[PDB]
Design a protein around this ligand. Structure first.
Ligand SMILES: [Zn+2]
Ligand SMILES: [Zn+2]
Ligand SMILES: [Zn+2]
Ligand SMILES: [Zn+2]
Ligand SMILES: [Zn+2]
Ligand SMILES: [Zn+2]
Lengths: 446, 446
């Protein structure tokens, strides 16, 4: 089963056939990509807000228009999927989902309302693919560059009526029915500590400083609880590297930042008529990103090494979280740098899958976003910025859908790509909930 | 080789598995969709400006979020393709193409600068797939709802340095080197008359009123020259239906409107804070569309019937032209109606291909566009509008990338879908110029 080794323009862009990305007929290669054998493992990579527009913009900037992302573009089976949410009151579709309803959809197979995690519109709990994988004896990992309490990694291990119920305090106030002291299952962080995935890596150390309002660990901070329940806690790249075993007896919990992990590249925010009034921008590496803080590609590798030891197999979710956050912030460099970061993690995943032979790798996004690539001389009503690309030309990015401080995500269908056993199920038009059923089936979870 | 008969939500949207579009594993069905046999015919359908966002918005409105376009969504092999143009002066990438450079790319296989038709950055001509098909003896058809001189159908039959060179007058002024009287090949309309495709249907009768400045037909209007050169001219549906033969001796030229054919649905223009200040809209059929004017689906059927008689095979291009124009106009209803219109033509094409067995059908767009689907309560800097969808819920559309009277197209990669022999070549990431090579090879044109 081949991965697309090179789909960059084959020659001179200005010449006949020079911009072609293909060098011959693809039929035979697609036939070799088709297999219904069971998958022993699944690696799901999520670019939050990484719709087709975000992928095109990052490619143009970092690899040039005729370039090619060795990870993101290398998946051979591609399709488009819908991710609409539900109106909680009426049950009718809500055309633009947030990260919580969408993460719930692929993780439980049931649509829900914006803001919900692991529950349907009647606030009923539904088991997630991670809980199911664990029940069957598979190793499980949940990796993200965001706070571990954020929507995407939280939907795999928590069931609360509002994504805001990070810890004990917000929960009592916003999710009374889930508040530990009122008899509920607990806050996102508490449920995360109970779910006990084998490998959990990300940011969000802040919330772990809260203290439980009830239960066995009442009065202990969530960090103490974790140590007490036997989790191996690591907080930097060296200690993360030192980990040699991660399992039910010694589950790994890596907290690498108080909030969201540092962004890869810095650049200024887009601005009104910024493509006209200001000079083009060249993104620059964030000095704070650090040799101390593991990258998304490192976390992914370490997670695969550990989850690997399980004979039954594993399920791993990896999230390039800040693509969406920088998109809301109208910051081209933060957004693109996070897309490049994700590509590196996709590459480690593909290398492993390529060798192993029984791993289904999927790369997609939870919803589309605001950024659009427009003509250089565009006079737009929103925020714009001109960037100096790898091609030595200027690309202009526009964010024109919000008068508020945060740009809105969007509802357009977007790319889903896959590689490995059962990858055929992402081709054509599908729904985000289909992804739950594809993964369950691929893994044979009954 | 199967078409996706049904990818609508399988049941109750609010229930587990109810929103799924798949009913079982797709592996076998995909293996059956794979064929490298030669294509006898090719039908290329283009939605101008129909990016994934446009497809999603039209689907939500007309079929409901869990709905499914029987034509557009039924193609089983899908991928994403890049359509960047070149800066004429530098030869570097220009991230946002216009309809002319993009149409040139899939029709000649060479990238070019915005505004160019059938020539590279050096202004050198390159043969089009239609000219090549014709030389090989295949019947050829070029159908559109725009003026026949517009970028999309023009790129198949003309080579001029600027899309604006509609007829004799604009050409002398704008394309001196192509001006007939200055020894050039002629205006778009004149080269169209020379190209002699067997079936040409669309609007743009206006320009045919011009008179040739030179050559055999100097002093005759372009309409006269057509009659003189042997073309069968039809201008309404009944006369179109009466045509029984179309070939090199009796080529058909249908002019159904002075300019662009009428739009299918009417609705108001999007407006500042329109989703907040004004009530939701329900689109309404255009009373002027007429029983007299063939629809795109009718033009397609007729063209297939006539091109069909050719034993060698045929090449047909069909354009749902006004999707792009209504998008520029920030008119949701016009935009959506034109996408539903294209769906019907896709349907006709698929029905024929399905029976015939040797027809490659491709549905894609030339570039992406402005419209975005945003949250209902969005307060945006641009033009917005709330619409009443088939689901009984409201969807909001936003156009926020231009302060001018025309919304800008965008540069995001977008969906390409295909069915039939050689369709595998549209899967994964490809380039718009690869489409030229895919069609030329599928057809065996040497
Ligand atoms: Zn999100
Ligand atoms: Zn997220
Ligand atoms: Zn977001
Ligand atoms: Zn166009
Ligand atoms: Zn067009
Ligand atoms: Zn346009």
């Amino acid at each position: 089963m081949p991965v697309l080794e090179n789909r960059a323009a084959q020659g001179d862009i200005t010449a006949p056939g020079g911009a072609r990305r293909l060098t011959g007929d693809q039929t035979a290669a697609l036939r070799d990509s088709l297999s219904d054998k069971p998958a022993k493992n699944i690696i799901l990579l999520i670019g939050d807000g990484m719709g087709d527009s975000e992928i095109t913009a990052a490619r143009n900037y970092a690899e040039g228009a005729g370039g090619f992302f060795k990870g993101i573009d290398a998946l051979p089976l591609t399709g488009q999927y819908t991710h609409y949410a539900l109106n909680k009151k009426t049950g009718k579709p809500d055309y633009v989902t947030d990260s919580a309803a969408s993460a719930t959809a692929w993780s439980t197979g049931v649509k829900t309302y914006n803001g919900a995690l692991g529950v349907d519109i009647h606030e009923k709990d539904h088991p997630t693919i991670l809980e199911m994988a664990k029940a069957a004896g598979l190793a499980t990992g949940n990796v993200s560059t965001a706070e571990l309490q954020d929507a995407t990694p939280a939907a795999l291990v928590a069931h609360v009526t509002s994504r805001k119920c990070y810890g004990p305090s917000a929960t009592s106030e916003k999710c009374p029915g889930n508040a530990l002291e009122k008899g509920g299952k607990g806050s996102i962080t508490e449920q995360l500590l109970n779910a006990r995935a084998d490998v959990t890596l990300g940011g969000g150390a802040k919330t772990f400083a809260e203290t439980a309002t009830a239960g066995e660990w009442q009065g202990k901070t969530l960090r103490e609880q974790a140590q007490a329940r036997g989790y191996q806690l690591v907080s930097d790249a060296a200690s993360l590297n030192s980990v040699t075993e991660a399992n039910q007896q010694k589950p790994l919990l890596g907290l690498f930042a108080d909030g969201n992990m540092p962004v890869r590249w810095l650049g200024p925010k887009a601005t009104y008529h910024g493509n006209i009034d200001k000079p083009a921008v060249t993104c620059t590496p964030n000095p704070q990103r650090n040799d101390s803080v593991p990258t998304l590609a490192q976390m992914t590798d370490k997670a695969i090494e550990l989850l690997s030891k399980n004979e039954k197999g594993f399920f791993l979710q990896v999230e390039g979280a800040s693509i969406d956050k920088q998109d809301h912030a109208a910051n081209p460099c933060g957004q693109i740098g996070e897309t490049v970061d994700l590509d590196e993690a996709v590459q480690r995943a593909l290398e492993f899958a390529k060798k192993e032979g029984n791993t289904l790798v999927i790369v997609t996004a939870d919803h589309a976003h605001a950024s659009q690539i427009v003509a250089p001389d565009t006079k737009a009503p929103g925020l714009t910025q001109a960037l100096n690309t790898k091609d030595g030309a200027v690309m202009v990015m526009s964010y024109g859908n919000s008068e508020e401080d945060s740009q809105e995500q969007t509802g357009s269908q977007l790319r889903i790509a896959a590689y490995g056993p059962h990858a055929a199920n992402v081709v054509g038009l599908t729904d985000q909930t289909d992804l739950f059923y594809t993964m369950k089936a691929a893994l044979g979870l009954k």
